[PDB]
């Protein structure tokens, strides 16, 4: 869980773009703004995270074990996007 | 429930654009595009689901309750910010 505070403390400081200790908004419009520039590289590290047997596909039973650890997934992404 | 996995299932449909039951690396980053076009009431409807005590910003404590709970995620968007 080291692991677990330093991705956290990682993203949120990236998100804070001006420092401030809060994230605004703006500031997670523009953070998500910032995949629709995707880059090739990062799609496949992401690709690698969900695709368990890197068999080069996500299955449904991948998908489904990665919302159940994620519960704010699909709640949040399916209903909003 | 049977609503949990038809929610599960939406999504999953929705991001396997050829519709062979699989999402590959090519439909991963299809979704993860999408985001580039984020809308000010989507980005207002996330805002509403972090910031819970309302006051319009996501303070540290907001964003750690919501990482805690999708620890994977978190992970992964890790390495793209
Ligand atoms: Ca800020
Ligand atoms: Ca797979
Ligand atoms: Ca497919
Ligand atoms: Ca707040």
């Not at 695709?51 to 489904?64: K, L, M, P, V, Y």
Request: charged share 35%.
């Amino acid at each position: 869980t080291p692991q677990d505070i330093a991705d956290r403390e990682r993203i949120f400081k990236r998100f804070d773009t001006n420092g401030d200790g809060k994230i605004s908004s703006s500031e997670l419009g523009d953070a998500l703004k910032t995949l629709g520039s995707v880059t090739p590289d990062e799609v496949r590290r992401m690709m690698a995270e969900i695709d368990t047997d890197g068999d080069g596909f996500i299955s449904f039973d991948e998908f489904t074990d990665f919302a159940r650890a994620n519960r704010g997934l699909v709640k949040d992404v399916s209903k909003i996007f």
